[PDB]
Structures are given as C-alpha cells and as structure tokens.
Amino acid sequence: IVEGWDAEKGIAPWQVMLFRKSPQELLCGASLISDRWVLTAAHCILYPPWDKNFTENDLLVRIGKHSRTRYERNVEKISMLEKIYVHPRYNWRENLDRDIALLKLKKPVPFSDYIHPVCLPDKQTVTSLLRAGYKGRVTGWGNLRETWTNEIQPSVLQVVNLPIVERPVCKASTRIRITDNMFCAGFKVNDTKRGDACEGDSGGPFVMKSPFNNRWYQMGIVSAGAGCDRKGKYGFYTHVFRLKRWIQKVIDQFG
Amino acid sequence: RNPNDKYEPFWEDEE
Amino acid sequence: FHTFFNEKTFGLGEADCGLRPLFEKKSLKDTTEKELLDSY
Ligand SMILES: *[C@@H]1O[C@H](CO)[C@@H](O)[C@H](O)[C@H]1NC(C)=O
Numbered sequence A: 001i002v003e004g005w006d007a008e009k010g011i012a013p014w015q016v017m018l019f020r021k022s023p024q025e026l027l028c029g030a031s032l033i034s035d036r037w038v039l040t041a042a043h044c045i046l047y048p049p050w051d052k053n054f055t056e057n058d059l060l061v062r063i064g065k066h067s068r069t070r071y072e073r074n075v076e077k078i079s080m081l082e083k084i085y086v087h088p089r090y091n092w093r094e095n096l097d098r099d100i101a102l103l104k105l106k107k108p109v110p111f112s113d114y115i116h117p118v119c120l121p122d123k124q125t126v127t128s129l130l131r132a133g134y135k136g137r138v139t140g141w142g143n144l145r146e147t148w149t150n151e152i153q154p155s156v157l158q159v160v161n162l163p164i165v166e167r168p169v170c171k172a173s174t175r176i177r178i179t180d181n182m183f184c185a186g187f188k189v190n191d192t193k194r195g196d197a198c199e200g201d202s203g204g205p206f207v208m209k210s211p212f213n214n215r216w217y218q219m220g221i222v223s224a225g226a227g228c229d230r231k232g233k234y235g236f237y238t239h240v241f242r243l244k245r246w247i248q249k250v251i252d253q254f255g
Numbered sequence B: 001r002n003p004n005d006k007y008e009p010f011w012e013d014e015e
Numbered sequence C: 001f002h003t004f005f006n007e008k009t010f011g012l013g014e015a016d017c018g019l020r021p022l023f024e025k026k027s028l029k030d031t032t033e034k035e036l037l038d039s040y
Helices: A123-129 A167-171 A243-253 C032-040
Strands: A013-023 A026-033 A037-040 A059-063 A077-079 A081-086 A102-104 A135-140 A158-163 A182-185 A205-209 A216-224 A235-239
Touching: A013 A037, A026 A205, A026 A216, A037 A135, A037 A216, A059 A081, A077 A243, A081 A158, A081 A216, A081 A243, A123 A216, A135 A216, A135 C032, A158 A182, A158 C032, A167 A182, A182 A216, A235 A243
Parallel strands: none
Antiparallel strands: A013 A026, A013 A059, A026 A037, A037 A102, A059 A077, A081 A102, A135 A158, A135 A205, A182 A235, A205 A216, A216 A235
16 A cells, blocks of 8 residues: 555454465455355456466465554454456456455454454445545555655555546546546545555555445455556446356356 | 565464 | 345345444444544
8 A cells, every 4th residue: 555554453344354275475455245255356366378376275365464464363364265256358458347256264253352344335335335535445555656766665554545536537547447446546636645555555455434434445446556657547346236247156156 | 584574583472 | 234135045134234243233343433433
C-alpha cells in the first residue's frame, strides 16, 4: 500500500494472506467470507504469460495476521486449500475482466478477536454505497513504494482509504477496455492525497462500512492497484456484487 | 538458518 | 442482518458477517472510519 499506515490489531479481521508453500513467499491479499471460503483475485492464481497456474497444493492462506513475517502464535491460523475456483470467464490475455477466484478451505477456521468474516453486498448495499466520492478501505502487505530508490516491504499490515471514481473518468484514464464488472478508485492528479494499492496488495479486499447496520461489506477485490511501480491514474477493482451470482453457483455447487 | 528464512517458521501448534 | 447462503455449503459466519470483535462489538472505533463515514 502506498501512503497508508500501520493497521490496528484486528482492524480487518477478514484480511487473508495468500502464501506460496515453496519458495515460501507472500503472493497476494485475500478475504475471509465464511469459515470455509476465501475470496482473492484470479490473476493471483493464474497468469499463463508468467507460467503461473497454482493448484490447491502449491498454496496456503494465513489468517488473523498483523506482522508480515513473524509467526503470530496463538493468533494467526494457517489453512490448507481444498480447492481453487477461478472464474471460467477470467480475462487474463487482455483486461482482467472477471478477476476473481474462490478458495475452499481444507477445514473450517475458528473465528476469534482477529478472525472474523466480511459481508458480501446485496443490491441495496451496492446502489447506496458504491458511489463516486464515497471512500472505501483497502488493506494489504503490498510494497510501500515504487522499487529502486528507506525500505519497501512493510513489517505490519497496511490500510489506506480511497475514494471511488466516476466510471467515465475511469474509462478515460486508460487504453484498457474497462467493463461493468470492475470499478476504479483513487484520488486525482492535482489532488492533495495520493494513496493507492500496489501489486502485492492484489486479491485483497476493498471494503465499505454501512452507515445503516454498521456492518462492513467487501465491494471489490484489488485487481490492479495503481501504486508503486505500476503507476496509472486509478486502481481497478473487481466488482464483487456483479459477480455475486457466480459466487453462489460455485459455492452452492462445490462445497 | 534464520537469515535464510525470509519468514519465521510457522508450523508449531499444528494438527 | 439477513442471510443469502446455505450454512452447509457456505460454512458458518454469514449471519454475523461484518462486525469486528475489537471495534464494533466493543463499541470502539478505529483511527480512521470517521473519514469514511464523513465521505458518505
Ligand atoms: C493450467 O491452466 C491451463 C490454462 O488455464 C489448463 O489448460 C491446465 O489444465 C492447467 N494445468 C494442469 C495441467 O492442471
């Protein structure tokens, strides 16, 4: 995350770390939606151009974490993955349309002060909170700044608040063909505040707290942060609700 | 060991 | 809150989804949710 700050313990109990079994390596962020299911980005699992095609066996998730590298005994939980489901329409060749994937946990994970699920959104939640200007929150252990110039890897989880941005404005900020399945967020050029998600924050959650019920909802999945080395105007996120149906089709049907 | 492990080992307290 | 999934295919959690143990449940606030609220 660029231009964010140290997360408070338990500020985002649904934050998950997608971890490569060997070489042990942090791959992406992810979110806990129930004690058996985790959401992350499809490109965090599959990307043919770089030889990436992970199976449930090569990966692992770490839950309830704060420190990026320490073993948080008695606090974090490690879980194996039973299966990985990448949206069958995931577009990696061109624009990441449908950049989402579902991971079923080998066993249910216990909730605690540090492990608690985030709500998915419904029609009402979308149309009332997903609007230009409204700020959402992104969390991650991605890099602190572009590479090659301090220290770039955080030692603890990071948070940053970002404002959604008008679609037409998102579309005109890139040659990439944007779709209804995604949305962008971030401050403007002349804007005083920067703050963005970087590459290692991919797959993580974009969440908004309802003013109604006080419940947090995950509106998007970091699909293409615009920070650090990537630099583009705004960051792009997979539109969770827009994919809510595929999420049931997968769940109701496989676990 | 240790500086050879970018991440502290995390299997204790397991299964 | 009002569910949407079947507990036996989705596991536990939905019903109480979205409420943080160390913040909401304790009537406590994190250092910056005001910023988010203010923008709504
Ligand atoms: C890797 O994914 C490719 C491209 O999506 C698919 O054809 C293949 O079945 C996957 N790897 C194997 C052999 O399991």
